Amino acid sequence: PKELVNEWSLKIRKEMRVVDRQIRDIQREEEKVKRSVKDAAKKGQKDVCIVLAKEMIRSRKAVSKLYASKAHMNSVLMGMKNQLAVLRVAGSLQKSTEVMKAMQSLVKIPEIQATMRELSKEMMKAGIIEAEMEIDRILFEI
Amino acid sequence: GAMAEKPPKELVNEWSLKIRKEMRVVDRQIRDIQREEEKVKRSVKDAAKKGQKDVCIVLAKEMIRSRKAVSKLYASKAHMNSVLMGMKNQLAVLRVAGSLQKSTEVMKAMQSLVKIPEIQATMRELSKEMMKAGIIAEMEIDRILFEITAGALGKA
């Protein structure tokens, strides 16, 4: 039907489980690296420390960019929520500007981008990606 | 400074609570507008059926304005959700460091968020609190080594 929404929610929600997992793993790694940095410091190995430290910055930045993604995705889920409404009201989808720039800053995250490119399209074709007709359009619940 | 008495970086839990609170508000306002669209709909129906063209027309302009009201709202909620995640991140950063740090993410959301229609004066206050905290090429590693080693391989 017009339950594309419910499918896309599920996928988005799916991709968010992955992001959670990715972030849960990196953090578990930072746990260890932090201990390494401690030992290395105690044994006075300056250079092992400097390197590891860099490992951490890289870690933090990685996680950050992940949460960025989770947010962009959540932005899309919300838009999906809203779509149901724009329907429950009239019965069409509306080119949301919101679910368009989010679904733009997401096809750019490293790993996941193949699905996101594929969803962006399905979305573009249901006609929510890329009034005086609406004032007429809306008059369709008559 | 001296025997100060600041809140520990649980300023994050506090801001989380408030952001979360404002999001219940938003949910509320969306729900109310939705509920009001239901009625305006019935109204538009009758007014069409009875040939009152001019009335449908205006009830329509009413309808569009609702829809945008909800849009702008869900927008804000996304923003808020972005700040919430940023806080989760800050907790993350603290879990291993124990000290907040910048965030061009929780800065722009909390920029676009300090709009006017609503009690969104609080957002201007959080905004403030957050800067003082220190949330809104490098000495990163030094600060880091110092963080992780309890000031033993200090900063430059």
From Swiss-Prot, chain A:
Changing Q45N: Abolishes dimerization. The record marks V37 as: Important for autoinhibitory function. This is Charged multivesicular body protein 3. It comes from the Eukaryota. Its overexpression strongly inhibits HIV-1 release. One of its GO terms (molecular function) is molecular function inhibitor activity. Belongs to the SNF7 family. Changing V48D: Abolishes interaction with CHMP2A and assembly into helical tubes in vitro. Changing V51D: Abolishes interaction with CHMP2A and assembly into helical tubes in vitro. It is a lipid-anchor. Its main location: cytoplasm. Residues 1-102 are annotated as: Intramolecular interaction with C-terminus. GO terms for cellular component: amphisome membrane; autophagosome membrane; cytoplasmic vesicle; cytosol; early endosome; ESCRT III complex; extracellular exosome; kinetochore. One of its GO terms (biological process) is late endosome to vacuole transport. It is found in: Cytoplasm, Cytosol; Membrane; Endosome; Late endosome membrane. The chain holds residues 12 to 172 of 222 of the full protein. Probable core component of the endosomal sorting required for transport complex III (ESCRT-III) which is involved in multivesicular bodies (MVBs) formation and sorting of endosomal cargo proteins into MVBs. MVBs contain intraluminal vesicles (ILVs) that are generated by invagination and scission from the limiting membrane of the endosome and mostly are delivered to lysosomes enabling degradation of membrane proteins, such as stimulated growth factor receptors, lysosomal enzymes and lipids. The MVB pathway appears to require the sequential function of ESCRT-O, -I,-II and -III complexes. Residues 11-43 form a coiled coil. Keywords: Apoptosis, Cell cycle, Cell division, Coiled coil, Cytoplasm, Endosome, Isopeptide bond, Lipoprotein, Membrane, Myristate, Phosphoprotein, Protein transport, Transport, Ubl conjugation. The acidic C-terminus and the basic N-termminus are thought to render the protein in a closed, soluble and inactive conformation through an autoinhibitory intramolecular interaction. The open and active conformation, which enables membrane binding and oligomerization, is achieved by interaction with other cellular binding partners, probably including other ESCRT components. The keyword ATP-binding does not apply. Widely expressed. Expressed in heart, brain, placenta, lung, liver, skeletal muscle, kidney and pancreas. Residues 48-53, 138-139 are annotated as: Important for autoinhibitory function. Probable core component of the endosomal sorting required for transport complex III (ESCRT-III). ESCRT-III components are thought to multimerize to form a flat lattice on the perimeter membrane of the endosome. Several assembly forms of ESCRT-III may exist that interact and act sequentially. Forms a metastable monomer in solution; its core structure (without part of the putative autoinhibitory C-terminal acidic region) oligomerizes into a flat lattice via two different dimerization interfaces.
